[PDB]
């Protein structure tokens, strides 16, 4: 009866539009990220499947600009409009100010975005979540965001497939200021856990970026180190 | 370029010559200046062609229009009114033209309208490059109480003055007098320069 | 047969869109706010789960300018961009007129955003429900707000889930005039005997502003010495 | 079959939509007006619940302008926002013609609004009715308007919950030119009878205003004097 | 299966919509008109219950201008309405061409208005239909229009409930040229026989205007005359 | 199944919506018109009522220029828009171009307008067919159009209701050349045979236009002698 | 379940509104066309009713301009406003950039508009389908349209009732380069295999063009002389 | 630039020259001044080369779609007065353009266009640079009892001589001559340099 | 319950609309593509029927520009139109920034288009699938795109009818650096297993472009020459 519409809300307050959404997040790849030292990290699980795909092509960490990435789960079309969303968005501050000072203030705007068809009747919404993190005026920052337009910061988390799982690994053993090589090393290993039902943890995409600098994106062979 | 309607008894007659010029260089001898705009009514034109035949269409078919919409003819005063309210409503980007209409529904009239939809009724008034000539000869020899033919030599005679005096007027004069009885009627060509000739006028 | 779509009055004059809008408010958490001595104060129930969320992050009584503050209930989404509308709402003022003089006013314009969901077809009511309060041109000021579009002064009063238990223990305790010091105490109690079936109070987050000057964010260990 | 959407006209000739509308009102509160010696007064029922409500802040008079006041029933959110657009609208009246003169004019305004929701396609109807009381260029006038843009000058009238009693107790007793105090009391016998199935009157809620100068809102006393 | 909807043909060549419409207006008060002598008149049947309604403000036949009024009847809503719509076109022809010339004109205006809501979709037609009467440029003119935007010009007429009846006994008795006086009787006289099944005529509205001057409006007294 | 909304194509390639429009038109008064000699006629059955109905007055044959009527059939209201928008389209030609040069033309217009409710979704179809008479540059032309805007041109033709009828009846009799007067009458009798089932052909309404000069009404008496 | 509504894809992969339209075409009359010498010819078989039709006025080959004519079946309004579109867009090119140089682009511009209606939700698609032939500044070129908007060059072809049936004939018998004598038979006699389960061929219609000049229509006894 | 159209018994003439200038500096010996617009009409280009050209392909169209959608040929004053509405319509930024469009319908004619959409119809007139002189032989010698032979001499004539007098005129001077019978006809090149020789002319 | 209306996530966060469309393109004839020695080759199975069809005309290989080409599989009216789109959207950015740089831009604009038609209510997907292959700024690139707005860059790749196939065939036979000769051949080859459940390749379209040059057309008798 109340669950085949998205307008509208049910008897008990919610959006079963919004909530079938987030049922296909759930159903996307498994990456998280975390603060540590003087920096933030992004892990996802590249898991791949014929040897005819083009490899390292299925970037799932991307970059927003030099010193911000996000990294996306969900219906992967709806994640790459909205990435470029962000990016233009990301530009606009830049021309406009001349300086993106606070990268909380990009992740509102694409979270506006989302939440927009939320209630403007016509128009299915957007059926994914991300985070992103970088280094901004304010220093490494960490945030997540889901279709119903939700945002919060963190201090290390998940999102895709695993995230109940790897969420609760680091919820117990994330150590605060953890230097960058035992940060990864924390990260594989909870994510790792977390996916790793199945064994193989294939082959991970890491990044990371330490106030400062720019983005360092891992290659093959250093992943492989902690892999 | 010279037009003139006047008022009498039971009756409306309107004549114009026929000369249009580029300055000096009068390049149409036979132009059309008088048109009936509805059966009982007619219109004289001056000033810009193009401004002028536009308007004059216009005027024609919202005239149709109505007559079948209404199953009446409008009144003098209402298309002289209409007229006004379009002319001004663009005073700002105007039609550069002046207007004489004049017909017959309960009464003979004859309205002066200006390019800034300025509207007037009169017993008679002229328009056009030659228009203080025949003022004159009108100010000195129209009457009330004349006949419609005296009346048509009237006119003939005024704008053949003009036609003396004004480089920018000539041709052929032609006119069209409207009665209730006959309607709107043109009088045929030889008989205007007939009368003409009569009088002892010339071209 | 009439609770399935919003527009819409019912047989009896309802518009059940609205009321499974108001459900979602009361699943939503607890806070309230009271008038005293010479300002007022807002207290909100700031119940966490997994040592992995950024603590403080997760601020319920937000800033809209200064001088004024608000919180909010319902669909998390749905009030930070009803909040953030009231933020620029409110600049807009300060910036035509040179100062914010009635905070009511503030109030009734984003009253009136959510108004016009209610009827304009195409579209979702806000599920949220938040209250203001701050001190204005008048004095210290106190209101709340539905997702009909209601709004209503008070001298004290609650919203979110614990509700109807919180509001009537002040309906019944609630002292006038009370010191900020006592004010605060007789709040943090109220909220505590109503969400407390739970026991333990956790850390509530709690504000106040006075007559004569800005807002003050109680820190931690402040908010701890009354809890 | 046929009273499920507002859109459209029933095979009897009757907007379904628009009764549904009715209805909400009937559950309005209780209020009234009449015309008297050389003004006109208006009376609303003010029912209170809880010790924790702003007591006068639930005003259910309104002034449009110190000249004109109207009173409402009916879904209260719809209320609010079409007071303000008559207030808007009579200031505009203002501004371009200078003053006022005619304030069935204002009424019929307010009317025209709600008569569009009653058939331009998706939008649902104002549940709400009320009544517009004050002395203009012609003098004391008093007009109530329904959900359906219906409008009607009356002698004395009411509307809310207890419109059929109290107004039958009126179409009776109603006395032509009752000076000031007979009339308020008259009235506030008529609000009596009629909603009083439940004994208590409560606190009524009453102004007045007389040709020659602007309107008067009685103090908790004076209307006490009446109870 | 056909008769819920307005939009739409039926299989029989037949909008229902505007069917369901006609409905309301037999619902309608009783009036009529005719042509008489050198003028037309109006009459209305003025049906009041309480002692409460104020008397002479529920006027029925309203002025346009001072050469042409109307009568309507149906949902009084959509009269009104669509009377002010005729009332500012009125004025519109008067204020480019100077003058009102044929009323034909401005009721057909008013129809090809009430044409429009019979095939533009979503929303509801007009439910009401009315007779304007006056003296033009072409002379005293008698028309009637329907919520199907159908108009005619009569010799006499009648509408809204006991138009068959009226409609019939003038069908018989009308006689072409009767003075006013005469008229007006026969007038009152079919207008009591139709709606007369319970007997009391009770006090009818009655105005007339004819060639060469402005609408007269029948005071009580003159009218009681004929009743 | 398919036979309740008008949109769209039924499985067989039909618009049912179109259909029914043209059983609207099957129950519309019977009319026809032909070429002759040296012009055109048009003749309607004009089928009266009520001696209350203001005869003449129900002009079924309508100008739409002096050289240029049309006749029509199906819902009034329709038909009469339809008209009006050819007669200002007619003007439009007239004004640009100084001169209707091709009639053909003036109907093609008024066509397209009628296919366009054919497909642009929200909006009833026109429930009328009708026929235009005239003579052109060209010379007479005779012309018709249904409610789904096709248009052909004839030698001679019927609408309405005994279409079938009258035109079979031509289909045998018609006589290419035949002067006026005899051409006046084939059609009477024409018309007679068809609608004739009840015997009398009451007042037939009959105008004509020849080359060379303007359409021609006839008067009562004059149709009174071919009937 | 999934045939009723035009918006949208089936499980299976099709527009079933669009395949309802085709139908609507099949139902059309039939036609064909191709490439022969040094031109292109194009044959429509005019089957005729009444005595009563003007016979020729119902022209199945329309030109669009001197070089270039079409044929069309279906839903014969459809067809008519489907031609003058690419007539006026005809007119457009030629305006532009002095000269129609290929007439492929004059069908995709007509081809898209169908198009549109196929994905643009509330608006019923073109039932029709036509061929445009005509020599370019590439040569004597032949293309066919149905109404989903598919466009294809043929060297010879047909549409419309019997289109199976002659295509097939031509698929068998067509003869490359054969001279417009020879071709304008095989044409006919294939028209008349496929249509002639009914023996007659009744008075086909035919034109034709050849590089160098303008379009031919065949006068009656010419096409007589085939037949 | 020098253009004229001619109206004669049972035909209309129309010719000009084709020197097409900047200033002094004359840039192109050849440009075209004649079009035909439709089966029994042609039109002659005269001011701003850019307005006239998209002129003539606009009026070349609208006439084309015309006669299919009425399936009979546009008649001359409906070209002339469709023409008339667009230029006026547009007078305040006007296609700097001056316009003879002349044809065969019922009869010949032959209106002369302004750039503010003045229309006025004549038995023959001139447009362009070198105006003034044709209308100075014409005025002296064209007759309406000419044949469509002495026509077209006596416009080779006048082009001739504006040629002489009008250093903005110049080069091949060419004339079709459009009959009912035959319809629009543009003459032989050859045998219009003949006739110059014959008529003792020049260039 | 679930698969009747695209607009709309299924409880299992899935868009049936999107997937209905991706059926539609299962149906589509084959086609693939792979980088080779420096270029890049597309092959598309080109499946004819009747002898009365215009050879090459199906052209189903087409181009974009000189150094970029394109091949569909779906609705094939769809893939026209969203052709025409890449095209001018190609001239677009040559025309602001002189140069077509970076082809993934061009097919990024495209899928965005489509990735629209996802989300705003109103309108039917694309029912499409189609591959971008040229070389640009970067070098030779291949790309495809499915009817959620989805793209990726291959080293090799198919789509359409037999996709699976094929594409596991390179999976395993792709070779890496494979010179133009051997490489067309591995696809035809590649093609061939796949369709090929029915013996005959019949006549493919294949075409080629290589850096420093622009595209190449195999002419009938090369393909002829592999196949």
Redesign the interface.
């Known amino acids: ?15 079963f ?1 919004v909530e ?8 996307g790849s498994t990456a998280l990220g975390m603060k540590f030292a003087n920096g933030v990290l992004l892990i996802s699980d590249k898991k791949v499947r ?5 490899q390292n ?2 970037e799932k960490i991307q970059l927003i600009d030099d010193y911000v990435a996000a990294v996306t789960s ?5 994640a ?2 909205l990435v ?1 969303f962000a990016r233009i968005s990301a530009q606009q501050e830049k021309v406009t100010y001349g300086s993106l000072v606070n990268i909380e203030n990009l992740v ?1 705007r694409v ?2 975005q989302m ?1 927009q ?11 994914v979540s991300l985070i992103f993190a970088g280094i901004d005026q304010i220093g490494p920052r960490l945030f997540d965001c889901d279709p ?10 998940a999102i895709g497939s695993g995230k109940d799982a790897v ?2 690994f ?3 053993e ?1 150590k605060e200021n953890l230097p960058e090589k035992e940060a990864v090393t924390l990260g594989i290993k909870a994510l790792k856990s977390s996916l790793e039902e199945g064994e193989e943890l294939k082959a991970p995409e890491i990044a990371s970026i330490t106030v400062g600098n720019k983005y360092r994106i891992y290659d093959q062979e250093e992943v492989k180190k902690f892999l | 370029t010279t037009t003139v309607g006047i008022t009498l008894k039971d009756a409306v007659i309107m004549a114009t010559e026929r000369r249009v010029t580029m300055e000096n260089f009068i390049m149409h001898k036979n132009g059309k200046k008088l048109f009936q705009i509805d059966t009982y009514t007619g219109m004289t034109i001056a000033g810009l062609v193009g401004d002028a035949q536009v308007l004059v269409r216009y005027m024609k078919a919202e005239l149709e229009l109505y007559r079948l919409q209404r199953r009446v003819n409008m009144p003098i005063e209402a298309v002289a009114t209409l007229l006004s309210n379009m002319l001004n409503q663009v005073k700002y980007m105007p039609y550069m033209v002046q207007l004489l209409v004049g017909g017959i529904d309960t009464a003979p009239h004859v309205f002066s309208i200006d390019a800034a939809g300025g509207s007037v009724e009169d017993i008679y008034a002229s328009t056009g490059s030659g228009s203080p000539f025949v003022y004159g000869v009108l100010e000195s020899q129209y009457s009330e109480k004349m006949t419609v033919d005296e009346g048509v030599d009237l006119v003939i005679r005024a704008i053949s003055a003009a036609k003396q005096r004004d480089s920018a007027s000539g041709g052929m004069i032609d006119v069209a007098v409207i009665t209730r009885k006959d309607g709107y009627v043109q009088l045929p060509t030889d008989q205007i320069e007939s009368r003409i000739r009569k009088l002892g006028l010339i071209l």
């Open positions: 009866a109340y669950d085949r519409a998205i307008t509208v809300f049910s008897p008990d307050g919610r959006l539009q079938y959404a987030r049922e296909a997040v759930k159903k014929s040897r005819l795909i083009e092509s299925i969900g219906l992967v079309a709806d790459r409009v470029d509102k979270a506006d939440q068809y939320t209630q403007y009747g016509g128009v299915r919404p957007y059926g119903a337009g939700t945002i919060n910061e963190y201090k290390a988390t969420v609760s680091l919820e117990r994330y």
